[PDB]
Design an enzyme around this catalytic site. Structure first.
Site, PDB file in Angstrom:
ATOM      1  N   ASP A 226       1.005  -1.223   0.089  1.00 36.83           N
ATOM      2  CA  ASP A 226       0.011  -0.159   0.110  1.00 36.83           C
ATOM      3  C   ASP A 226       1.068   1.233   0.158  1.00 36.83           C
ATOM      4  O   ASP A 226       1.079   2.100  -0.897  1.00 36.83           O
ATOM      5  CB  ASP A 226      -0.966   0.150   1.140  1.00 36.83           C
ATOM      6  CG  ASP A 226      -2.315   0.564   1.037  1.00 36.83           C
ATOM      7  OD1 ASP A 226      -3.194   0.513   1.583  1.00 36.83           O
ATOM      8  OD2 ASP A 226      -2.325   1.085  -0.320  1.00 36.83           O
TER       9      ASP A 226
ATOM     10  N   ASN B  18       4.354  -9.806   6.046  1.00 40.18           N
ATOM     11  CA  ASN B  18       3.037  -9.511   6.184  1.00 40.18           C
ATOM     12  C   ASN B  18       2.017  -9.554   5.077  1.00 40.18           C
ATOM     13  O   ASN B  18       2.428  -9.390   3.767  1.00 40.18           O
ATOM     14  CB  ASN B  18       2.994  -7.514   6.460  1.00 40.18           C
ATOM     15  CG  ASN B  18       1.594  -7.030   6.525  1.00 40.18           C
ATOM     16  OD1 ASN B  18       0.912  -6.952   7.468  1.00 40.18           O
ATOM     17  ND2 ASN B  18       1.383  -6.532   5.262  1.00 40.18           N
TER      18      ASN B  18
ATOM     19  N   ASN C 115      -5.400  -9.586   9.900  1.00 40.95           N
ATOM     20  CA  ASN C 115      -5.833  -8.251   9.289  1.00 40.95           C
ATOM     21  C   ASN C 115      -7.153  -8.388   8.835  1.00 40.95           C
ATOM     22  O   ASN C 115      -7.187  -9.187   7.753  1.00 40.95           O
ATOM     23  CB  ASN C 115      -4.746  -7.828   8.291  1.00 40.95           C
ATOM     24  CG  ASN C 115      -3.518  -7.438   8.797  1.00 40.95           C
ATOM     25  OD1 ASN C 115      -2.624  -7.282   8.046  1.00 40.95           O
ATOM     26  ND2 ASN C 115      -3.224  -7.478  10.003  1.00 40.95           N
TER      27      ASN C 115
ATOM     28  N   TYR D 262     -11.205  -6.976   7.464  1.00 41.09           N
ATOM     29  CA  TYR D 262     -11.890  -5.668   7.208  1.00 41.09           C
ATOM     30  C   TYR D 262     -13.225  -6.021   6.811  1.00 41.09           C
ATOM     31  O   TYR D 262     -13.671  -5.441   5.628  1.00 41.09           O
ATOM     32  CB  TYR D 262     -11.199  -5.067   5.802  1.00 41.09           C
ATOM     33  CG  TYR D 262      -9.763  -4.631   6.425  1.00 41.09           C
ATOM     34  CD1 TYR D 262      -8.606  -5.335   6.337  1.00 41.09           C
ATOM     35  CD2 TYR D 262      -9.474  -3.307   6.733  1.00 41.09           C
ATOM     36  CE1 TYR D 262      -7.621  -4.885   6.506  1.00 41.09           C
ATOM     37  CE2 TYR D 262      -8.404  -2.648   7.040  1.00 41.09           C
ATOM     38  CZ  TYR D 262      -7.271  -3.476   6.915  1.00 41.09           C
ATOM     39  OH  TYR D 262      -6.179  -3.095   7.246  1.00 41.09           O
TER      40      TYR D 262
ATOM     41  N   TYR E  52     -13.791  -3.816   2.725  1.00 40.98           N
ATOM     42  CA  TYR E  52     -13.768  -4.444   1.410  1.00 40.98           C
ATOM     43  C   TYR E  52     -14.863  -5.363   1.011  1.00 40.98           C
ATOM     44  O   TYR E  52     -14.767  -5.596  -0.084  1.00 40.98           O
ATOM     45  CB  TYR E  52     -12.513  -4.863   1.341  1.00 40.98           C
ATOM     46  CG  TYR E  52     -11.263  -3.953   1.424  1.00 40.98           C
ATOM     47  CD1 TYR E  52     -10.190  -4.124   2.343  1.00 40.98           C
ATOM     48  CD2 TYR E  52     -11.338  -2.768   0.631  1.00 40.98           C
ATOM     49  CE1 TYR E  52      -9.408  -3.013   2.544  1.00 40.98           C
ATOM     50  CE2 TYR E  52     -10.172  -2.101   0.669  1.00 40.98           C
ATOM     51  CZ  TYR E  52      -9.236  -2.107   1.699  1.00 40.98           C
ATOM     52  OH  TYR E  52      -8.105  -0.940   1.483  1.00 40.98           O
TER      53      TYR E  52
ATOM     54  N   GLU F  98      -4.399  -5.517  12.101  1.00 45.17           N
ATOM     55  CA  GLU F  98      -5.110  -4.269  11.365  1.00 45.17           C
ATOM     56  C   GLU F  98      -6.561  -4.408  11.468  1.00 45.17           C
ATOM     57  O   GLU F  98      -7.106  -5.422  11.047  1.00 45.17           O
ATOM     58  CB  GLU F  98      -4.442  -4.359  10.023  1.00 45.17           C
ATOM     59  CG  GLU F  98      -3.060  -4.463   9.617  1.00 45.17           C
ATOM     60  CD  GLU F  98      -2.759  -4.191   8.130  1.00 45.17           C
ATOM     61  OE1 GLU F  98      -3.475  -4.219   7.396  1.00 45.17           O
ATOM     62  OE2 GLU F  98      -1.295  -4.079   7.696  1.00 45.17           O
TER      63      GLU F  98
ATOM     64  N   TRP G 292      -5.763  -0.228  12.472  1.00 45.87           N
ATOM     65  CA  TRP G 292      -5.082   0.040  11.175  1.00 45.87           C
ATOM     66  C   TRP G 292      -5.030   1.364  10.969  1.00 45.87           C
ATOM     67  O   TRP G 292      -5.927   2.126  10.780  1.00 45.87           O
ATOM     68  CB  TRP G 292      -5.254  -0.576   9.942  1.00 45.87           C
ATOM     69  CG  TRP G 292      -4.570  -0.143   8.651  1.00 45.87           C
ATOM     70  CD1 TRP G 292      -4.760   0.081   7.700  1.00 45.87           C
ATOM     71  CD2 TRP G 292      -3.037  -0.381   8.803  1.00 45.87           C
ATOM     72  NE1 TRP G 292      -3.946   0.372   6.898  1.00 45.87           N
ATOM     73  CE2 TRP G 292      -2.533  -0.081   7.533  1.00 45.87           C
ATOM     74  CE3 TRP G 292      -1.901  -1.011   9.610  1.00 45.87           C
ATOM     75  CZ2 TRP G 292      -1.259  -0.024   7.208  1.00 45.87           C
ATOM     76  CZ3 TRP G 292      -0.692  -0.801   9.353  1.00 45.87           C
ATOM     77  CH2 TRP G 292      -0.442  -0.192   7.932  1.00 45.87           C
TER      78      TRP G 292
ATOM     79  N   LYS H 269      -7.072   5.536   6.340  1.00 47.03           N
ATOM     80  CA  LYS H 269      -7.383   4.705   7.727  1.00 47.03           C
ATOM     81  C   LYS H 269      -6.908   5.130   8.914  1.00 47.03           C
ATOM     82  O   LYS H 269      -7.224   4.536   9.942  1.00 47.03           O
ATOM     83  CB  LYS H 269      -7.106   3.476   7.384  1.00 47.03           C
ATOM     84  CG  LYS H 269      -8.193   2.747   6.493  1.00 47.03           C
ATOM     85  CD  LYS H 269      -7.534   1.339   5.851  1.00 47.03           C
ATOM     86  CE  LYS H 269      -8.576   0.825   5.221  1.00 47.03           C
ATOM     87  NZ  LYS H 269      -8.053   1.018   3.780  1.00 47.03           N
TER      88      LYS H 269
HETATM   89  C1  LIG Z   1      -6.987  -6.305   2.623  1.00 45.45           C
HETATM   90  C2  LIG Z   1      -5.589  -5.595   2.759  1.00 45.45           C
HETATM   91  C3  LIG Z   1      -5.542  -4.443   3.573  1.00 45.45           C
HETATM   92  C4  LIG Z   1      -4.409  -3.814   3.720  1.00 45.45           C
HETATM   93  N1  LIG Z   1      -3.476  -4.616   4.627  1.00 45.45           N
HETATM   94  C5  LIG Z   1      -1.902  -4.042   4.471  1.00 45.45           C
HETATM   95  C6  LIG Z   1      -1.820  -2.658   4.604  1.00 45.45           C
HETATM   96  O1  LIG Z   1      -0.434  -2.295   4.423  1.00 45.45           O
HETATM   97  C7  LIG Z   1      -2.776  -1.718   3.945  1.00 45.45           C
HETATM   98  O2  LIG Z   1      -2.525  -0.365   4.286  1.00 45.45           O
HETATM   99  C8  LIG Z   1      -4.118  -2.334   4.293  1.00 45.45           C
HETATM  100  C9  LIG Z   1      -5.090  -1.635   3.411  1.00 45.45           C
HETATM  101  O3  LIG Z   1      -5.380  -1.772   2.258  1.00 45.45           O
HETATM  102  O4  LIG Z   1      -5.883  -0.380   3.990  1.00 45.45           O
END
Ligand SMILES: CCC[C@@H]1NC[C@@H](O)[C@H](O)[C@H]1C(=O)O
Ligand SMILES: CCC[C@@H]1NC[C@@H](O)[C@H](O)[C@H]1C(=O)O
Lengths: 600, 600
Positions: free
Chosen positions: B166, B413, B467, B469, B473, B505, B550, B569
């Site tokens: 990212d 990660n 992690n 979400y 997403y 996250e 996150w 975020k």
């Molecule tokens: C579904 C992947 C999410 C992703 N996870 C890794 C972080 O380095 C990103 O910032 C985060 C994002 O996309 O907000």
């Protein structure tokens, strides 16, 4: 004031004329009256929406800041099934000054910017053909207007309007235009008054002017079941065992007054709520029970209509006030659209009704630049002014007298009572208002700098209304000094007058999005902290029976180094989005018991 | 990894060389190596600040998106009172690739972008005169870099870097540059390990490479009173009755190792905290007591320095994390500036230490437009790649091994573990890491779409890091489905592995200022509601021992239709201002008892 009731739909009716699209043209050099533009179709026009302010409909600063006369125009076909009926043409609000031509006959004239005006125009139209309505609208304020102002003419003769209130001087036809038909037997006016004892039973005295014939009345139920009947042009008392109008609910009976002539009948339904307001010592009673006001000073102000009434806006803003826990509000700085007092009537919203008398103060504007030296004087607030004011109270009370939601009149807002002659001015206005309606209390909203040891006129009114801004305009940014100053000033007011105290304005400018760890001015965190400290002080003073934060939404004002795109004191943005403080209030206002003061 | 300790100040010292202003020039057509620019003063240069990314210092998109080689340069006067001493030149971080000339002699080379590199350069300088330092910095990523990427050359030969993480690919000299002097008796490396039983007493085994002579050690107090003494190049055990390093406090003894040669002495103080981390069943113990992680995934990212280390930024961001109640964080997606691990050491902040291995996944980017078809393959993540990774773990553990704040290593990660060969890749890396340091647990942060029934490699690690979400997403905007999906997936992970689960996250993009009554995505209200539901689910699952939302602040990313000026975020804006959710967390994290899981 002159007899007037809301046009309501019976077996005799009305046809809406806010068709929106009218012909509009400004009259830059007053050629209008000279060429009597009312005679032929407007030369060089553009479409305007009615109702709505003319200022922001065209995204042009030169119309927005325009001072002078503007012209609206529209043809209408009068329905023919109205022959042998009285035809009346009612403007519910033409802001500041208006006069109108039914093609070539002039019918009406009016200087009040927020109260309706009509005239029987049955002899100037005949049903079946289409006549041209021409309106001349003036947006100028002098010292004999409500509110006052000073037009000033530069070297070149261009007008620029100066005024002494915060909100922007929107103008135009702001509310409903309307042709309505009534039978040739007139129900010109009705007055209803309510009494109660211990919630078990009592009565509603009554008076009626019905110009043309016998009157019988029936008060009917929510079920429209007859619960009592009367007979007579006045008296018309009946007794009940009713479910009486209460803040959380708003139970409305229906007073059906009938006017029998020898050939014609006329039927009017007027909604009534059985409520009794009074004040005793430091308590504001409603049906003999103390009450706690919560809510807002509001405004008629939205993003592209200015002060134009709008139904969606009314529905959505009531949805927000309901969610947030507000039980009351006050029609800040002018009479509102009667639609809103009908809404408050049906839903049990308590309303402090105010006239347009703001800006009777030359101590509030602050900056670096000629205002008169004597507020109360022949050149400024004069005798003509006092009669203009008394007329404004006359119209507002004449129009909102029978509304159960209206719980108090407010003559003016933040006048300067320091100069001598303030009491000379306001005393006869207070007394006159008291004779125009003895049913509800009388207030005059008090400005920050006429403190308890300084104010001159609060003796004359029933309930004390305070606009306080410790921590914002003075003690700027310091919550610990603002709390002390506020608490001793509140206690001082209580010692001096032993009245109920309603804090009718208290708020801070808050930029939505501006956040700060340091809780400094203009951040959302500051709005929350500030309102929260004010709330602790209210909770610690016996006599405070009400809190209305200053402004529900951000609104537009005149341009200046103190207004960032307008006054930002709203809990909501102009497009109704909530700032952080919106959830602070929602937590308080729905946490307390309804209508009860938080016990600390 | 190769022996290395932080340069600390004893009776032998260092002179800071982040004088900031260096000569910088980009090398657009690789003329640099050919003309060996290292030989004469840089042609056509501009001033650059060191440390700081070169991308945003000049407000120019053509430097910002530049791919290739850049050149930094600076003359230095070597102090003469250093004659007869070993002079070493250490770069604490040159991001991605760097090689350097002491005028004309090349001394160092390095491919790790976030770990230091030095070289004994005593025979290439003599004290008293000024020599020119020239650095060549490369910002290119291929499949054998950590992190990986694909440079792609268009028709015209211009490079554009593509990557699969990212955050934005900042480059330059991000941290301290430094000349330091040490006596000709080398204390090249120290390793300290701690044991405890029932908090009453135990010991710190020890090992040391001291290239040139006898070693004695004294562990001293916060009072620097000697509490034990040892003798020997290894062993060096002593037993205590200590006040042991605890999260809220962080008590640090001082291991003073002395290296006596026959003529020269060398003194090194290395701060030690007596802590014991392990995992038992579903509990993460620290000094034999369960722990609850609270806090953030962070980033090295600020408004004009990119990833450049900055002391004010460190002090202020620790002030915010302390206020907000955070007790832990993880060095999200690359090793951080050792200054931050010293800070966490002194203040008792618990840190999950991570390598730069992000982007081992081609399933995360989403859009409308050639990435390899086999993640694990010769063309992509290959054998060279695995040794590069093992090298990255080697350097990070080599540098942060003795820090009490470091409580766990994280190899990578969000890798994709679906394709076959994911376990072939990661298994020897997990085993190797376990032999490089058996003191702390091993984790590998798990991506949303390798769910509990799908993931391949979590068997190999000690603590499960998620992690998640749901509601952002997937199940976008729906809190009631996200809660169910999240709760069964958490319970599923627990049934499958019976490990401690840390949600490393969880967050949503939130535009500061965007408010909504409808609690929809991108509003602050949505951030609050979302985090709050996630918190109810955490509180209802036994095995969850940690929560790190996150991002602490908004940070910059590559350009795309999913990133509005960056990843939004953060709880704080990039300039550290709090969104509404910042006060939600502050209420939770300081409401609970320190280090304890909320009992629901
Ligand atoms: C579904 C992947 C999410 C992703 N996870 C890794 C972080 O380095 C990103 O910032 C985060 C994002 O996309 O907000
Ligand atoms: C001290 C005077 C405060 C003033 N009170 C009247 C309101 O009409 C204004 O909006 C308000 C303000 O200035 O915010």
């Amino acid at each position: 004031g002159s007899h007037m009731l809301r046009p309501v739909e019976t077996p005799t009716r009305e046809i809406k004329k806010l068709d929106g699209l009218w012909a509009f043209s400004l009259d830059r050099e007053n050629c209008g009256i000279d060429q009597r533009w009312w005679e032929s179709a407007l030369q060089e026009s553009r479409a305007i929406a009615v109702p709505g302010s003319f200022n922001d409909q065209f995204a042009d600063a030169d119309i927005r800041n325009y001072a002078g006369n503007v012209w609206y125009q529209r043809e209408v076909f009068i329905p023919k099934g109205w022959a042998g009926q009285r035809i009346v043409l009612r403007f519910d609000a033409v802001t500041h000054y208006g006069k109108v031509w039914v093609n070539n006959q002039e019918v009406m004239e009016h200087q009040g910017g927020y109260t309706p005006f009509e005239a029987d125009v049955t002899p100037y139209v005949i049903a079946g053909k289409s006549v041209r309505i021409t309106v001349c609208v003036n947006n100028e304020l002098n010292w004999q207007t409500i509110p006052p102002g000073m037009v000033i003419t530069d070297e070149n003769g261009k007008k620029k309007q100066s005024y002494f209130h915060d909100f922007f001087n929107y103008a135009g036809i702001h509310r409903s235009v309307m042709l309505y038909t009534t039978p040739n037997t007139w129900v010109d006016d009705i007055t209803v008054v309510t009494h109660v004892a211990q919630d078990c039973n009592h009565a509603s005295v009554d008076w009626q002017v019905v110009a043309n014939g016998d009157v019988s009345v029936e008060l009917r139920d929510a079920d429209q079941q007859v619960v009592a009947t009367g007979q007579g042009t006045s008296g018309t008392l009946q007794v009940v065992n009713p479910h009486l109008w209460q803040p959380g609910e708003g139970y409305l009976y229906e007073l059906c007054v009938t006017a029998k002539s020898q050939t014609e009948c006329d039927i009017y339904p007027l909604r009534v709520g059985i409520r009794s307001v009074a004040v005793k010592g430091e308590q504001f009673l409603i049906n003999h029970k103390p009450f706690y006001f919560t809510g807002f000073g509001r405004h008629e102000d939205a993003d592209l209509r200015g002060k134009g009434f709008d139904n969606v806006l009314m529905v959505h803003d009531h949805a927000l006030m309901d969610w947030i826990g507000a039980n009351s509000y006050r029609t800040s700085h002018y009479p509102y659209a009667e639609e809103m007092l009908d809404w408050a009537d049906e839903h049990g919203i308590v309303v402090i009704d105010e006239t347009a008398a703001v800006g009777f103060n030359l101590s509030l504007g602050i900056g670096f630049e000629n205002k008169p030296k004597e507020l109360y004087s022949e050149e400024a607030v004069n005798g003509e002014t006092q009669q203009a004011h008394l007329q404004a109270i006359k119209e507002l009370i004449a129009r909102d007298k029978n509304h159960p939601s209206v719980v108090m009149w407010s003559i003016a807002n933040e006048p300067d009572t320091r100069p001598q002659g303030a009491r000379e001015y306001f005393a006869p206005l207070a007394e006159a208002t008291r004779k125009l309606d003895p049913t509800r209390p009388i207030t005059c909203v008090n400005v920050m700098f006429c403190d308890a040891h300084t104010d001159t006129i609060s003796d004359l009114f029933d309930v004390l209304c305070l606009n306080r801004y410790y921590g914002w305009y003075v003690q700027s940014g310091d919550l610990e000094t603002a709390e002390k100053v506020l608490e001793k000033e509140l206690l001082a007011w209580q010692e001096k007058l032993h009245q109920p105290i309603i804090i009718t304005e208290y708020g801070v400018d808050t930029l939505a999005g501006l956040h700060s760890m340091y809780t400094d001015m203009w951040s959302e965190e500051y709005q929350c902290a500030w309102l929260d400290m004010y709330h602790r002080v209210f909770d610690r003073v016996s006599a405070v029976v009400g809190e209305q934060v200053w402004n529900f939404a951000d609104f537009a004002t005149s341009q200046g180094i103190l207004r960032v795109g307008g006054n930002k004191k709203g809990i909501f943005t102009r497009d109704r989005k909530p700032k952080s403080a919106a959830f602070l209030l929602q937590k308080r206002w729905t946490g307390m018991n309804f209508g009860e003061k938080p016990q600390q």
